[PDB]
Structures are given as structure tokens and as C-alpha cells.
């Protein structure tokens, strides 16, 4: 009701409805540390919040008091907890609260407490009907918001809403193929539905990735996905991959490609292949290429990798 | 350029003093701001410029002690501040009942951490109560919540539980088997560690995961050599000059610690490029007010000031103590803890 | 800014 910035706003200490309550002040003792100075209004709202809390008053006036405390500081987890307690006691309309929190989160998309509150509400209502769309909007003012992606995966998993995610992913990867969060989302969807054991799917995906790599060859995300979905079955077990990459080298070379190759050669050495000593040289040759010219910032690392390979396969 | 050491000492000094109402959103996390400042002064070997006794009392006033009937054991630990309005009591008298007063795992962590940094011996810490409260926070999947009343759960709090159990030198505070399970399940397809299973691997969670295992002394036991090599690769790939927390994300000063410390724990930080990292961290230094910011030409803050310094520490900056990469306190402090532990064992 | 909690 009465906004904190309204011309007619009144301190709680001057409100009739709060005459019976004695405000409770905060006290950090003799020598306060990391003390925050509060305005009259701020201290006022909270001195009454402490009062209501201390008495665990499940009143309607308390419910309203929280709205003010939250406006003053939406990071106070206790306030949100108490507000949830009241939401139940007073049996408030949860669909209304959904609007409230939707507004709040838009204003503070990186606040832990608000995303938790929304998650609790969705669990209560057992209604995920508006989640995917809401998150998509938040992901519009920041396509990498960790809070958003985390909430999105929870909703999708909890109410089994996989049907359209792989499509959403394809769309976002077109808007920015470098968004690591989307590549993770892609793997999330696939491994939680078809899985990667279906050679048909594995093929589709490896192909999809190589296409994205060709569009923007310098993209750690795309390369990490490619290696990710293949590293466990064994990179050396895909002879045509080694060649297709060796062919890309000329035009689409990048440190990621060279690194991938090193990893393929290492998988081979790992599986006692043909030309043990010859392969190791192809590996070492690349490690040095990385250290000396391709990924110089990691010069000491690549040399370290080289020495590691050499002392393990000689 | 150079490291304006004194400037930074003044910076942390101010932080322990008074903050502008613009930092009101840190109210319930004041104790972690204290930590950033105290541990930051410690790192600069300037703890003298503060009254260790006053602060120790303040910290102890934040401990949620068990009540007479001890019916609130599941809620003991430390508060972030006095925002609930409980009468100042430096862990002198028994706990005064309150429907909503209970600890916060991040506060218990930074609380104990602060006490040790200040020289206190933790004698006034109801260790059993804390551990009781800790246990109450762990979920079936192995991760933890921050408060008994409920909260989100993820790797951040697994690291908090680990630090607490380590400092109180007692792991009865958690079901280590389940915790390790959680940490494993969080490894991504790209080999980094995320906040939880399926999520995007991240520098912050990777540090929390690896550091927790190191604190439990089970790094080698949980991850295979092949696995550790893949994790190392993921981490070392985070350096662009300074460090970012995720692929294709801009660098941020604090990651020079988050990732750098992980690389250190994995014994390969030595192979990173020191100059570019140092140069970046310094480019975010505020030569006027002190402290560091996440990005250059950006406002400084206690968090980036502390982590920026710890980042420099990793590379043995002239004038900064060596930081214990897993416990996030200076080595000096980590040792005072070793002795403190031996003491009890009698 | 970096919100950790
Ligand atoms: C006080 C203390 C030392 C606590 C240790 C335990 C914790 C809470 C560790 C947190 C590590 C960490 C850096 C987590 C990520 C924090 N975020 C900022 C998450 C989501 O927001 P984004 O803006 O997407 O983050 P970013 O882009 O910085 O990864
Ligand atoms: Zn940061």
C-alpha cells in the first residue's frame, strides 16, 4: 500500500496500527565492526521488523511490513523466510506472489534469495506453466546469468519439460555460438533424454558441432562439447575424426584444434597403438607448436604436458 | 605498476570501521566483510592496526549458542550480524530463545576463520553445537544449505562445511561419503566442476570442490590421474591474462584466486603465466582509495581487494604473506591452527 | 560487483 517514497509515507513509529508494538533496536555492542549507517526510514522499518519477528506475529500488518523490508534490502534471507511463513499462515494468494517475485527478480536478477523464493513458490503451486518464458526473458538481459540457467534446469527436470528445450538451445546458439551456458544446456537436454549412446544421435551432434566450429573456429565452448561427448568412448576410436581435423588445420586452425589433436594422439598411446614412438613424436611436435606459437600464454603448461607424455611412452 | 601496499592497509581499515548506507544489502553478511578485511590485513601483515580484543568480542556476540534446554542444537553456529536485535552477548551467557535466530554456514565458516586470524583459541566456541548445526544442513544428495530454515544448496556451502570441519578438526560435522559423491557428480562434460550436477562448470565451484577434497585429504582418492589431468586442463585454460570463471567470459580479478588457488592445489599453478596475471590484477588496483575491483577502471570493494591480494600472494608478491590455497587464510594463520589443534590433542 | 551470498 503506502510506498516508501510516497509523499504521504509515515514512519511506523508514527502509525496508529503499530502503537501497541515496541520497536526492537539492533545493537553491535561497545565497539561495532563493519557497521552500516542507516537512514531514519531504514532503521524504522527494520526496528519494527525485529519486533514482529521476535514475537513471531503472523499478522496481516506484518506481511505488509515485509514488503517494505524487502524493498529496503532484498538480500535479507530471514525477511524472505518470514514472508513465506506468513504466506502460509495468512493463506495468501500464491498466484499474486508469483507476480510480486517476478517483478523483484527482474530488478535484481543476481540475488540468491529471490530465485530461491521463486523456486519455493513453484514447488508449492506445482505449476511450472510460466517458468520457461520468464527465464527466457531474464536470459535476455544476460544470456549467461548462472541463477537463470540453474533455475531453468530445475524446472525442466522437476516437471519433465524437455520437449522444446533442444530447440531453444539451437536458437540461442544462433544468437551467440560462444555462449558457454547454452552449450552446457545442450548437453543437459540430450543426456537427459536420448542420451549419446544412440550412434545416430552421437553422429548428429558431432556433425552439428563441427559445423559450428567451421563458422567460428576459435570457440573453446564448441571444442569442449565435441571433446566432451567423445572423450569417454575414446577419442582414438574415431579414425575419420582425426583426419577431418587434420584437414581443417590449414584453414580453421586454432589452439583448441591443436589441443584436441594432442589429446587424440594421447588416447592412442594410451591404447598401445601402431607406431608408439612415431605417434609420441606427432604429439610432442604439437605440444611445442602450442607452447612456441599457438597458445604461448600456456607455454610452460604445454612443455609440461610434453615432458609428461615423453616420460610415459618411451 | 607497483603494489600500493599501505594504501590497501588503509582500505581494509576503513572497512572494519563504518560503511555507507549504500552497502545495506551486506547487512546479513557483515561477518564475511570483516573476514575480507581482517584476513586481508593479515595477508599484508598489518593486524596490529586493529584492536584484536574488541573484534573478538564482537565476533563472539554473533555465535548462536544452545539454550538452557538445548532444544536449538540444530540451529547453532554464527550469525552474519546482529540484524535480528538480540541483546549483545559475547558468548558469555546461555542462548536466549528466539523463533528465528540461527546460524548461517558461511558465517560459521568466516566466523571461526576470523577468530583464528585474530589469535583467539576457540575456547568459547561450542564446538559440539556448531557441528550439530552443520550436520543438520547437509541434504540427502551430500550438499548443504546455509541455514536450517532452508535455502538454496550447492558447492559453495559444501566448501563451507569442509572448512568448518577442518578448523574444528572434527569431521563428524558431515557425512563425508555423501559430500564426496556430490562433488564428483558435479564434474561437467568439459571436465570442470559446477555448482551441482548438470550445471555449467564454473571457476568458483571448481575451487570449492577441489579445495573441499584437499581439506578432507582425499583429492587423489576421489579423482583418477586421468580425471585430475582433465580438471587441470580446464583450469589452466581459464587464464586469458587475468582469469575468468567460465569459457568465453570476461576476466575478473577474484578468479586469480578462485582458479589460481585451484591450480596451486593441483600443483601446476607454476606453469601459468605470472606476469600477465600480475599485470591484470594490478590494472584493477585503485591507486587513490586502495583495494581492487573486478575490472580495471571500476570501483574497488572488500571482496576484490582481498582476493586480488590473495591472487598476488599465490605468485609470492613482495610484501604479502603466502596464502593457504585451500583454507583461504594466510599460511601463518594455517600454522597457528596446526598448533592450536595439537594443543587440544592432550 | 560479485554477489557470493
Ligand atoms: C566468503 C567466502 C570466502 C565464501 C566461500 C564460499 C563461496 C560462497 C564461494 C563462491 C564462489 C563463487 C565465485 C561463485 C559464483 C558467484 N556468482 C557471481 C554466480 C552467478 O552470477 P554470475 O554473474 O553469472 O557470475 P559470474 O559471471 O561471476 O560467474
Ligand atoms: Zn569477482
XYZ file of C-alpha atoms and ligand atoms in Angstrom:
695
model
C 0.000 0.000 0.000
C 1.894 3.056 1.311
C 5.070 3.247 -0.776
C 8.427 4.016 0.848
C 8.888 7.021 -1.397
C 5.294 8.322 -1.266
C 4.882 11.985 -0.215
C 2.484 10.810 2.474
C 4.697 7.979 3.739
C 4.750 7.737 7.545
C 7.326 6.174 9.854
C 5.997 3.065 11.584
C 6.742 4.746 14.917
C 4.056 7.273 13.969
C 1.432 4.833 12.738
C -1.633 4.116 14.847
C -1.831 0.473 13.738
C 1.648 -0.016 15.234
C 1.149 1.810 18.520
C 0.937 -1.403 20.551
C 4.274 -2.745 19.311
C 7.609 -1.720 20.837
C 10.342 -1.386 18.218
C 13.402 -3.594 18.790
C 16.753 -1.914 18.035
C 19.864 -3.629 16.737
C 22.993 -3.383 18.877
C 26.546 -4.369 17.903
C 27.823 -3.695 21.403
C 30.671 -1.396 22.604
C 32.866 -1.435 19.503
C 30.861 -2.210 16.327
C 32.702 -3.711 13.344
C 31.861 -3.156 9.675
C 28.897 -1.060 10.789
C 26.478 0.232 8.159
C 24.870 3.627 8.786
C 21.101 3.623 8.324
C 18.651 6.380 7.441
C 15.729 7.144 9.740
C 13.327 5.382 7.390
C 15.506 2.302 7.034
C 16.173 1.871 10.734
C 12.482 2.483 11.368
C 11.177 -0.284 9.091
C 13.653 -2.768 10.497
C 13.206 -1.850 14.143
C 9.593 -2.885 13.674
C 10.552 -5.930 11.615
C 12.712 -7.141 14.513
C 9.751 -6.551 16.816
C 7.326 -8.587 14.736
C 9.901 -11.356 14.194
C 10.778 -11.654 17.863
C 7.085 -12.213 18.585
C 6.548 -14.463 15.578
C 3.455 -12.372 14.882
C 1.624 -13.946 11.957
C -0.367 -10.767 11.279
C -1.524 -9.142 8.065
C 0.274 -5.952 9.073
C 3.476 -7.962 9.416
C 3.005 -9.358 5.928
C 2.908 -5.801 4.618
C 5.890 -4.794 6.734
C 7.969 -7.404 4.893
C 7.254 -5.751 1.548
C 8.990 -2.651 2.896
C 11.873 -4.585 4.439
C 12.361 -6.349 1.140
C 12.360 -3.075 -0.758
C 14.999 -1.761 1.625
C 17.100 -4.931 1.322
C 16.048 -7.932 -0.773
C 19.169 -9.795 0.328
C 17.916 -10.364 3.870
C 17.137 -14.081 3.740
C 15.376 -14.013 7.104
C 12.863 -11.496 5.814
C 12.030 -13.751 2.860
C 11.725 -16.769 5.136
C 9.321 -14.971 7.476
C 7.384 -13.714 4.465
C 6.965 -17.321 3.326
C 5.816 -18.288 6.821
C 3.172 -15.561 6.586
C 2.219 -16.545 3.039
C 1.118 -19.865 4.508
C -0.372 -18.688 7.831
C -2.459 -15.976 6.181
C -3.155 -18.329 3.275
C -2.276 -15.589 0.774
C -2.920 -15.924 -2.941
C 0.243 -17.538 -4.279
C -0.533 -16.592 -7.863
C -0.319 -12.983 -6.719
C 3.019 -13.626 -5.008
C 4.272 -15.056 -8.315
C 3.721 -11.626 -9.867
C 5.462 -9.945 -6.956
C 8.575 -12.095 -7.180
C 8.591 -11.875 -10.973
C 8.919 -8.106 -10.675
C 11.537 -8.313 -7.915
C 13.759 -10.739 -9.813
C 13.666 -8.567 -12.922
C 15.077 -5.723 -10.831
C 17.654 -7.955 -9.097
C 18.486 -10.953 -11.324
C 21.678 -11.801 -9.419
C 20.168 -12.063 -5.934
C 20.284 -15.583 -4.442
C 17.354 -15.070 -2.049
C 14.845 -14.058 -4.731
C 15.496 -17.036 -7.002
C 15.140 -19.336 -4.026
C 11.828 -17.725 -3.120
C 10.530 -18.229 -6.659
C 11.632 -21.875 -6.638
C 9.763 -22.480 -3.378
C 6.604 -20.924 -4.815
C 6.710 -23.012 -7.969
C 7.078 -26.114 -5.776
C 4.086 -25.029 -3.699
C 1.867 -24.371 -6.727
C 3.239 -27.398 -8.593
C 2.742 -25.056 -11.558
C 5.661 -24.546 -13.968
C 3.420 -23.076 -16.674
C 5.133 -19.684 -16.743
C 8.706 -20.621 -15.846
C 10.388 -21.260 -19.190
C 9.082 -17.989 -20.622
C 10.072 -15.961 -17.558
C 13.605 -17.330 -17.559
C 13.881 -16.671 -21.303
C 13.170 -13.002 -20.589
C 15.725 -12.791 -17.809
C 18.180 -14.529 -20.131
C 17.559 -11.608 -22.455
C 19.184 -9.029 -20.211
C 22.017 -11.536 -19.579
C 22.250 -14.783 -21.535
C 24.807 -16.180 -19.062
C 23.069 -15.444 -15.763
C 24.010 -18.521 -13.720
C 20.955 -18.094 -11.461
C 18.672 -18.165 -14.500
C 20.181 -21.264 -16.083
C 20.176 -23.058 -12.748
C 16.505 -22.296 -12.198
C 15.760 -23.315 -15.785
C 17.369 -26.717 -15.362
C 15.478 -27.267 -12.120
C 12.109 -26.534 -13.704
C 12.815 -28.620 -16.769
C 13.958 -31.578 -14.664
C 11.329 -31.300 -11.918
C 8.332 -31.108 -14.259
C 9.922 -33.037 -17.129
C 9.657 -30.254 -19.711
C 12.278 -31.414 -22.224
C 10.035 -31.284 -25.318
C 11.160 -27.844 -26.538
C 14.496 -27.203 -24.872
C 16.774 -28.583 -27.582
C 15.046 -26.136 -29.937
C 15.541 -23.213 -27.531
C 19.209 -24.178 -27.371
C 19.550 -24.222 -31.183
C 18.032 -20.752 -31.268
C 20.364 -19.261 -28.663
C 23.439 -20.834 -30.237
C 22.498 -18.901 -33.368
C 22.315 -15.634 -31.428
C 25.751 -16.291 -29.931
C 27.622 -19.504 -30.663
C 30.157 -18.512 -27.997
C 27.726 -18.702 -25.083
C 29.161 -21.491 -22.948
C 25.970 -21.653 -20.882
C 23.923 -22.682 -23.926
C 26.385 -25.393 -24.920
C 26.041 -26.788 -21.400
C 22.270 -26.564 -21.727
C 22.503 -28.536 -24.944
C 24.393 -31.364 -23.253
C 21.959 -31.178 -20.324
C 18.981 -31.785 -22.605
C 20.447 -34.512 -24.747
C 21.986 -36.574 -21.962
C 18.678 -36.392 -20.098
C 16.597 -37.637 -22.996
C 18.032 -39.637 -25.878
C 21.496 -39.870 -24.339
C 24.614 -40.162 -26.510
C 24.703 -43.954 -26.888
C 22.480 -43.829 -29.950
C 25.171 -43.672 -32.629
C 22.590 -41.816 -34.690
C 22.483 -39.042 -32.096
C 26.221 -39.014 -31.401
C 26.733 -38.591 -35.151
C 24.156 -35.807 -35.417
C 25.831 -33.965 -32.557
C 29.441 -34.386 -33.663
C 28.315 -33.122 -37.064
C 26.383 -30.203 -35.578
C 29.411 -29.137 -33.574
C 31.885 -29.393 -36.458
C 29.549 -27.100 -38.395
C 29.555 -24.525 -35.608
C 33.310 -24.868 -35.286
C 33.670 -24.084 -39.003
C 31.610 -20.911 -38.517
C 33.717 -19.681 -35.594
C 36.845 -21.915 -35.305
C 38.091 -20.077 -32.216
C 35.433 -21.109 -29.702
C 36.502 -23.075 -26.634
C 32.869 -23.965 -25.873
C 32.212 -25.754 -29.155
C 35.502 -27.642 -28.873
C 34.859 -28.609 -25.247
C 31.452 -30.021 -26.189
C 32.937 -32.023 -29.054
C 35.706 -33.491 -26.880
C 33.226 -33.849 -24.039
C 30.792 -36.180 -25.783
C 33.610 -38.298 -27.227
C 36.367 -38.345 -24.598
C 34.828 -41.196 -22.655
C 34.174 -43.583 -25.512
C 37.775 -42.996 -26.586
C 38.950 -40.231 -28.926
C 41.234 -42.624 -30.834
C 38.271 -44.880 -31.681
C 37.104 -42.424 -34.374
C 39.660 -42.615 -37.250
C 37.688 -40.282 -39.522
C 37.659 -37.578 -36.837
C 41.433 -37.437 -36.705
C 41.611 -36.917 -40.469
C 38.745 -34.449 -40.739
C 40.528 -32.355 -38.121
C 43.957 -32.660 -39.751
C 42.227 -31.274 -42.855
C 40.676 -28.343 -41.007
C 44.094 -27.367 -39.623
C 45.107 -25.431 -42.769
C 42.151 -23.022 -42.776
C 40.347 -23.327 -39.405
C 43.390 -23.827 -37.133
C 43.311 -22.603 -33.520
C 44.872 -23.648 -30.206
C 41.718 -25.671 -29.451
C 42.141 -27.783 -32.590
C 45.845 -28.465 -31.929
C 44.996 -29.355 -28.336
C 42.277 -31.748 -29.485
C 44.809 -33.462 -31.751
C 47.280 -33.814 -28.884
C 44.513 -35.457 -26.877
C 43.712 -37.855 -29.719
C 47.353 -38.878 -30.020
C 47.487 -39.368 -26.285
C 44.458 -41.640 -26.348
C 46.266 -43.713 -28.990
C 49.455 -44.018 -26.924
C 47.148 -44.961 -24.053
C 45.776 -47.833 -26.128
C 49.143 -49.241 -27.317
C 48.560 -48.313 -30.984
C 50.748 -48.863 -34.078
C 53.895 -46.692 -34.181
C 54.046 -45.915 -30.450
C 57.301 -43.973 -30.892
C 56.047 -42.278 -34.068
C 52.788 -41.088 -32.506
C 54.526 -39.688 -29.420
C 56.581 -37.532 -31.792
C 53.476 -36.240 -33.532
C 52.125 -35.344 -30.099
C 55.306 -33.665 -28.838
C 55.614 -31.808 -32.149
C 52.192 -30.277 -31.477
C 52.783 -29.549 -27.789
C 55.752 -27.455 -28.847
C 53.701 -25.827 -31.595
C 51.242 -24.807 -28.885
C 53.917 -23.549 -26.456
C 56.081 -21.721 -29.010
C 53.424 -20.247 -31.318
C 49.740 -21.252 -30.891
C 48.939 -20.931 -27.164
C 52.018 -19.131 -25.817
C 50.379 -17.917 -22.605
C 50.340 -21.588 -21.590
C 53.894 -22.150 -22.849
C 55.075 -23.630 -19.549
C 51.993 -25.848 -19.320
C 52.291 -27.372 -22.794
C 56.005 -28.078 -22.311
C 54.981 -29.733 -19.043
C 52.438 -31.835 -20.936
C 55.126 -32.777 -23.451
C 57.596 -33.901 -20.774
C 54.698 -35.844 -19.226
C 53.957 -37.692 -22.440
C 57.616 -38.366 -23.159
C 58.298 -39.905 -19.755
C 55.157 -42.045 -20.013
C 55.584 -43.541 -23.503
C 59.313 -44.103 -24.166
C 52.848 -0.768 -11.990
C 53.539 -1.288 -8.287
C 51.614 -2.626 -5.345
C 50.410 0.297 -3.205
C 50.551 -1.767 -0.012
C 49.890 0.930 2.609
C 47.019 2.290 0.571
C 45.430 -1.163 0.787
C 46.064 -1.395 4.520
C 44.152 1.849 4.989
C 41.384 0.466 2.751
C 40.742 -2.623 4.918
C 40.971 -0.367 7.987
C 38.031 1.719 6.771
C 36.046 -1.454 6.024
C 36.271 -2.530 9.666
C 35.051 0.910 10.681
C 31.900 2.281 9.036
C 30.177 1.729 5.688
C 27.767 3.958 3.652
C 24.078 3.028 3.723
C 24.698 2.008 0.130
C 26.100 -1.292 1.464
C 22.913 -2.079 3.362
C 22.487 -5.228 1.270
C 25.536 -6.720 3.003
C 23.952 -6.373 6.441
C 23.390 -10.103 6.995
C 26.877 -10.865 5.639
C 28.864 -8.304 7.612
C 30.982 -11.034 9.171
C 32.313 -12.062 5.752
C 33.195 -8.427 5.065
C 35.086 -8.457 8.373
C 36.892 -11.574 7.182
C 37.856 -9.983 3.861
C 39.281 -7.070 5.841
C 40.923 -8.917 8.711
C 42.316 -11.751 6.610
C 43.322 -9.060 4.174
C 45.294 -7.185 6.839
C 46.749 -10.483 7.968
C 47.870 -11.145 4.397
C 49.595 -7.735 4.469
C 50.946 -8.389 7.954
C 49.133 -5.394 9.500
C 46.801 -6.937 12.051
C 48.356 -4.618 14.600
C 46.407 -1.612 13.265
C 43.265 -3.080 14.855
C 42.183 -3.945 18.379
C 42.095 -7.737 18.204
C 40.204 -7.895 21.518
C 37.271 -5.670 20.606
C 36.757 -7.544 17.368
C 36.995 -10.946 19.041
C 34.189 -9.901 21.391
C 32.064 -8.669 18.522
C 32.547 -11.954 16.701
C 31.643 -13.994 19.770
C 28.479 -11.917 20.168
C 27.467 -13.396 16.815
C 27.539 -17.017 17.986
C 24.220 -18.803 18.280
C 24.733 -20.776 21.484
C 22.460 -23.579 22.659
C 19.688 -22.556 25.037
C 19.205 -23.940 28.551
C 17.115 -26.897 27.360
C 19.464 -27.273 24.377
C 16.431 -27.667 22.093
C 18.066 -25.475 19.447
C 21.183 -27.519 18.731
C 20.224 -27.962 15.060
C 20.479 -24.190 14.716
C 23.795 -23.302 16.311
C 26.714 -21.651 14.553
C 27.266 -17.962 13.796
C 25.142 -15.031 12.564
C 26.252 -12.632 9.845
C 25.455 -9.659 12.087
C 23.111 -8.503 14.836
C 20.249 -7.589 12.475
C 17.785 -9.729 14.488
C 18.058 -7.473 17.511
C 19.345 -9.978 20.037
C 20.952 -8.390 23.126
C 24.754 -8.177 22.741
C 26.339 -11.184 24.456
C 29.971 -12.202 23.683
C 29.261 -15.918 24.206
C 29.260 -15.190 27.943
C 25.748 -16.295 28.983
C 23.484 -19.124 27.695
C 21.494 -18.773 24.484
C 18.343 -16.636 24.579
C 15.486 -18.343 22.704
C 14.226 -16.662 19.521
C 11.856 -18.168 16.909
C 14.086 -17.170 14.001
C 17.628 -16.927 15.321
C 20.078 -19.467 13.924
C 23.458 -19.667 12.233
C 24.479 -19.368 8.597
C 27.066 -21.840 7.329
C 29.049 -19.126 5.532
C 29.109 -17.105 8.748
C 30.168 -20.014 10.955
C 32.962 -20.539 8.444
C 34.149 -16.923 8.210
C 33.463 -16.529 11.918
C 35.822 -19.289 13.064
C 38.203 -18.258 10.325
C 38.250 -14.718 11.781
C 38.712 -15.865 15.375
C 41.802 -17.890 14.421
C 43.216 -14.992 12.384
C 42.821 -12.771 15.459
C 44.668 -15.200 17.709
C 41.690 -16.444 19.687
C 41.896 -20.109 20.736
C 38.240 -21.013 20.050
C 37.694 -21.925 23.694
C 34.382 -20.045 23.741
C 33.133 -21.831 20.633
C 30.602 -24.567 21.470
C 32.233 -26.964 19.002
C 29.677 -29.711 19.518
C 26.787 -27.308 18.938
C 28.349 -25.988 15.744
C 28.984 -29.491 14.423
C 25.434 -30.422 15.386
C 24.112 -27.475 13.403
C 26.372 -28.319 10.465
C 25.097 -31.889 10.240
C 21.549 -30.518 10.173
C 22.353 -28.592 6.993
C 23.523 -31.471 4.802
C 20.974 -32.828 2.318
C 20.430 -36.376 1.045
C 22.499 -35.674 -2.072
C 25.505 -34.665 0.008
C 25.384 -30.885 -0.475
C 24.472 -28.305 2.170
C 22.091 -25.429 2.842
C 23.184 -22.209 4.510
C 20.502 -22.077 7.195
C 18.277 -24.632 8.942
C 15.159 -22.699 7.897
C 16.011 -23.586 4.304
C 17.894 -22.067 1.382
C 19.390 -22.964 -1.960
C 22.046 -25.685 -1.849
C 25.267 -26.052 -3.795
C 29.047 -26.411 -3.881
C 29.549 -23.061 -2.121
C 28.186 -24.490 1.108
C 29.975 -27.829 0.697
C 33.196 -25.821 0.874
C 31.910 -24.005 3.949
C 31.135 -27.283 5.727
C 34.559 -28.589 4.775
C 36.331 -25.515 6.190
C 34.336 -25.714 9.406
C 35.039 -29.434 9.938
C 38.702 -28.809 9.192
C 39.092 -25.862 11.569
C 37.240 -27.558 14.405
C 39.425 -30.511 13.441
C 36.423 -32.832 13.588
C 34.631 -34.281 10.573
C 31.590 -35.514 12.455
C 30.066 -32.335 11.090
C 29.273 -34.003 7.776
C 28.688 -37.295 6.009
C 31.917 -37.123 4.026
C 30.976 -40.050 1.804
C 27.849 -38.247 0.585
C 29.691 -34.934 0.237
C 32.365 -36.551 -1.955
C 29.600 -38.120 -4.002
C 28.125 -34.662 -4.620
C 31.491 -33.191 -5.610
C 32.042 -35.985 -8.124
C 28.564 -35.732 -9.598
C 29.208 -32.050 -10.275
C 32.018 -32.632 -12.764
C 30.949 -31.438 -16.221
C 31.424 -32.936 -19.668
C 34.079 -30.262 -20.200
C 35.773 -31.527 -17.036
C 35.299 -28.503 -14.802
C 33.182 -28.604 -11.627
C 29.796 -26.874 -11.456
C 27.582 -25.773 -8.589
C 25.773 -29.071 -8.893
C 25.139 -31.933 -11.307
C 24.296 -30.906 -14.846
C 25.035 -27.230 -14.331
C 27.718 -25.297 -16.212
C 31.172 -25.958 -14.750
C 32.490 -22.798 -13.091
C 35.720 -21.495 -11.599
C 34.087 -20.740 -8.269
C 32.519 -24.164 -7.792
C 35.639 -25.872 -9.113
C 37.669 -24.193 -6.379
C 35.059 -25.140 -3.779
C 35.028 -28.738 -4.974
C 38.782 -29.253 -5.267
C 39.556 -27.300 -2.084
C 36.993 -29.329 -0.125
C 38.605 -32.587 -1.223
C 42.059 -31.272 -0.315
C 40.775 -30.208 3.084
C 39.459 -33.776 3.556
C 42.777 -35.004 2.188
C 41.130 -37.141 -0.473
C 41.944 -35.408 -3.745
C 43.974 -38.323 -5.143
C 41.491 -40.836 -3.771
C 38.400 -39.298 -5.391
C 39.679 -38.396 -8.854
C 41.788 -40.632 -11.096
C 45.012 -39.350 -12.613
C 43.207 -39.120 -15.950
C 40.397 -37.165 -14.307
C 42.800 -34.835 -12.496
C 44.574 -34.182 -15.783
C 41.298 -33.170 -17.403
C 40.393 -30.898 -14.485
C 43.853 -29.310 -14.631
C 43.356 -28.695 -18.327
C 40.028 -26.988 -17.671
C 41.516 -24.742 -15.012
C 44.726 -23.781 -16.825
C 42.519 -22.808 -19.793
C 40.892 -20.081 -17.690
C 43.862 -17.733 -17.998
C 43.455 -15.071 -20.682
C 45.845 -12.672 -18.926
C 43.915 -12.450 -15.689
C 41.383 -15.238 -15.091
C 37.723 -15.659 -15.994
C 35.338 -18.049 -14.259
C 33.888 -19.705 -17.383
C 34.857 -20.126 -21.050
C 34.056 -17.096 -23.208
C 33.502 -14.901 -20.140
C 35.468 -11.698 -19.361
C 38.291 -11.933 -16.772
C 37.594 -10.893 -13.189
C 40.258 -10.174 -10.562
C 38.816 -12.522 -7.941
C 39.348 -15.519 -10.228
C 43.105 -15.045 -9.908
C 42.418 -16.636 -6.562
C 39.467 -18.942 -7.280
C 41.197 -20.557 -10.261
C 44.771 -19.770 -9.259
C 44.289 -21.447 -5.895
C 42.816 -24.487 -7.648
C 45.798 -24.676 -9.992
C 48.021 -24.409 -6.907
C 46.226 -27.252 -5.152
C 46.674 -29.265 -8.368
C 50.378 -28.413 -8.293
C 50.513 -26.740 -11.706
C 49.981 -23.044 -10.937
C 53.728 -22.844 -11.530
C 53.173 -23.434 -15.237
C 50.825 -20.452 -15.625
C 51.997 -17.093 -16.963
C 52.743 -14.946 -13.881
C 53.441 -11.595 -15.492
C 50.201 -11.249 -17.446
C 48.208 -12.309 -14.400
C 50.013 -9.890 -12.079
C 49.696 -7.108 -14.616
C 45.948 -7.627 -14.867
C 45.346 -7.760 -11.097
C 47.273 -4.501 -10.754
C 45.362 -2.848 -13.589
C 42.310 -3.145 -11.311
C 44.031 -1.531 -8.327
C 42.546 1.770 -7.111
C 45.629 3.957 -6.603
C 43.517 6.613 -4.896
C 41.313 4.819 -2.350
C 43.062 1.440 -2.309
C 41.714 -2.078 -2.785
C 40.956 -3.744 -6.130
C 37.970 -4.011 -8.471
C 36.822 -6.904 -10.655
C 37.752 -4.951 -13.794
C 40.118 -2.048 -14.478
C 38.585 1.429 -14.179
C 35.874 0.074 -11.903
C 35.127 0.701 -8.221
C 37.020 -1.346 -5.605
C 35.441 -3.417 -2.832
C 36.410 -5.656 0.099
C 35.921 -8.851 -1.900
C 38.096 -7.976 -4.868
C 40.591 -6.198 -2.638
C 41.074 -9.387 -0.610
C 41.014 -11.889 -3.463
C 43.108 -9.596 -5.608
C 45.708 -9.631 -2.859
C 45.432 -13.404 -2.382
C 45.898 -13.700 -6.133
C 49.134 -11.740 -5.918
C 50.113 -13.855 -2.906
C 49.943 -17.038 -5.000
C 52.806 -15.618 -7.084
C 54.717 -14.526 -3.943
C 54.210 -10.763 -4.257
C 56.804 -8.649 -2.439
C 55.203 -7.773 0.856
C 52.343 -10.281 1.027
C 52.156 -13.461 3.081
C 51.765 -16.825 1.360
C 48.120 -17.815 1.388
C 46.996 -21.344 2.235
C 45.162 -22.112 -1.083
C 42.600 -24.480 0.409
C 41.678 -22.759 3.689
C 41.763 -19.156 2.462
C 43.728 -17.771 5.441
C 47.428 -16.876 5.466
C 49.850 -19.804 5.930
C 50.927 -18.134 9.173
C 47.326 -18.476 10.326
C 47.046 -22.028 8.982
C 50.023 -22.949 11.161
C 48.702 -21.203 14.262
C 45.782 -23.569 13.627
C 48.053 -26.644 13.471
C 49.446 -25.741 16.919
C 46.002 -24.915 18.208
C 44.948 -28.407 17.095
C 47.923 -30.157 18.736
C 47.015 -28.357 21.969
C 43.574 -29.955 22.124
C 45.125 -33.373 21.464
C 46.238 -33.871 25.086
C 30.225 -6.330 -8.279
C 30.215 -10.072 -7.385
C 27.413 -11.370 -5.173
C 28.589 -14.525 -3.384
C 25.709 -14.905 -0.930
C 33.091 -15.674 1.984
C 33.657 -16.910 1.354
C 35.169 -16.921 1.296
C 32.871 -17.884 0.860
C 33.360 -19.142 0.183
C 32.231 -19.999 -0.315
C 31.605 -19.385 -1.546
C 30.264 -18.734 -1.260
C 32.205 -19.394 -2.782
C 31.602 -18.746 -4.014
C 32.441 -18.889 -5.285
C 31.841 -18.185 -6.495
C 32.791 -17.159 -7.079
C 30.579 -18.440 -7.000
C 29.943 -17.737 -8.209
C 29.164 -16.455 -7.816
N 28.283 -15.866 -8.848
C 28.600 -14.459 -9.113
C 27.188 -16.651 -9.508
C 26.155 -16.245 -10.585
O 26.286 -14.903 -11.074
P 27.115 -14.618 -12.436
O 27.086 -13.072 -12.666
O 26.587 -15.380 -13.632
O 28.622 -14.979 -12.068
P 29.956 -14.907 -12.869
O 29.774 -14.368 -14.256
O 30.850 -14.003 -11.977
O 30.499 -16.347 -12.848
Zn 34.726 -11.183 -8.923
